[PDB]
């Protein structure tokens, strides 16, 4: 009575009457997402219906994790929670979780290959880093930032779509069998920034092994010290490739490609796109870089931050929805 049902392909969205004009804008393993209009807030929203949250303990655990992080994380550069609801009236009936977010206009996929000025390039990158820094402060290291999971609006604002864990943006740590730390996310920021400048994908590998080869072809074969950190079996492959010297960042990103500034961008790129993470720039240093620091505002860039049965997870999730 507070709710109505809309058929969305083979799926039924049963949602508060305030949400109208539902249309499917995507799906995946964990949910189906519709664009909608919210009649109470008077704005466009994205409505995500979780897919099989209680099929097993692993689904339930992830669903619980997502709900909590969205509630607790609040930052202008991270997709926020507008609302959560279930159409069911009790724990015994409880089945469906609906998460409501602000509706963004686009992801970065096409936008970054349209040629942008330095102001838009650096402003967008500034917002990305602010989002990431806030994720890291909450103990979330993404590991899978790409243009498709970073969203924007026609007013040049930007939010990170999800909390992470197309291989083009995956750091060498991820590609190979390695440990990672916070700066794993810096690699992905670098790949995006490079793509903005050059107008196409930097390292377009045709498979997971090929992804590695396109990286070294441009940047150079990593040092012996780095090779030592590899697991034995990945090391046997990696270490025995032809030896590439790489190209300087002037060769990779010459003035021709750009709209003091281009020199500053190259410098930043040369520090983000480092194969060996122990020699790669941190998020804090990236935010302080002359190319990025022009936008600095501490309220944005220095903002303050187990085992259960299925029915136990249901209960914990139901509490969270309520």
């Amino acid at each position: 009575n507070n709710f109505y049902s809309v058929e969305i392909g083979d799926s039924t969205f049963t949602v508060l009457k305030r949400y109208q004009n539902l249309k499917p804008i995507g799906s995946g393993a964990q949910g189906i997402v519709c664009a909608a209009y919210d009649a109470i807030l008077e704005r466009n929203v994205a409505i995500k219906k979780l897919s099989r949250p209680f099929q097993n303990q692993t689904h339930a655990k992830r669903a619980y994790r997502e709900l909590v992080l969205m509630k607790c994380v609040n930052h202008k550069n991270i997709i926020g929670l507008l609302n959560v609801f279930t159409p069911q009236k009790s724990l015994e009936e409880f089945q469906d979780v609906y998460i409501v977010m602000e509706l963004m206009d686009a992801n970065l996929c096409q936008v970054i290959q349209m040629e942008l000025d330095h102001e838009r390039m650096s402003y967008l990158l500034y917002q990305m880093l602010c989002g990431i820094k806030h994720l890291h402060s909450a103990g979330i290291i993404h590991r899978d930032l790409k243009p498709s999971n970073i969203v924007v609006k026609s007013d040049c604002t930007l939010k990170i779509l999800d909390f992470g864990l197309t291989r083009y943006y995956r750091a060498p740590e991820v590609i190979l069998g390695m440990g990672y730390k916070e700066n794993v996310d810096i690699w992905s920021v670098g790949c995006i920034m490079g793509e903005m400048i050059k107008g196409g994908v930097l390292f377009p590998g045709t498979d997971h092994i090929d992804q590695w080869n396109k990286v070294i072809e441009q940047l150079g074969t990593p040092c012996p010290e780095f090779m030592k950190k590899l697991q034995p079996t990945v090391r046997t492959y990696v270490e025995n490739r032809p030896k590439y010297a790489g190209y300087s960042f002037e060769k990779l990103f010459p003035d021709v490609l750009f709209p003091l500034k281009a020199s500053q961008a190259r410098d930043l790129l040369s520090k983000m796109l480092v194969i060996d993470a122990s020699k790669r720039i941190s998020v804090d240093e990236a935010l302080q870089h002359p190319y990025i620091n022009v936008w600095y505002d501490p309220s944005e860039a220095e903002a303050p931050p187990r085992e259960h049965t299925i029915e136990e997870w249901k209960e914990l999730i139901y509490k969270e929805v309520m």
Binding site: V111, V152, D155, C156
Partner: peptide
Amino acid sequence: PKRPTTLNL
């Protein structure tokens, strides 16, 4: 510098 307020989609 003032922040961009537009972006082409």
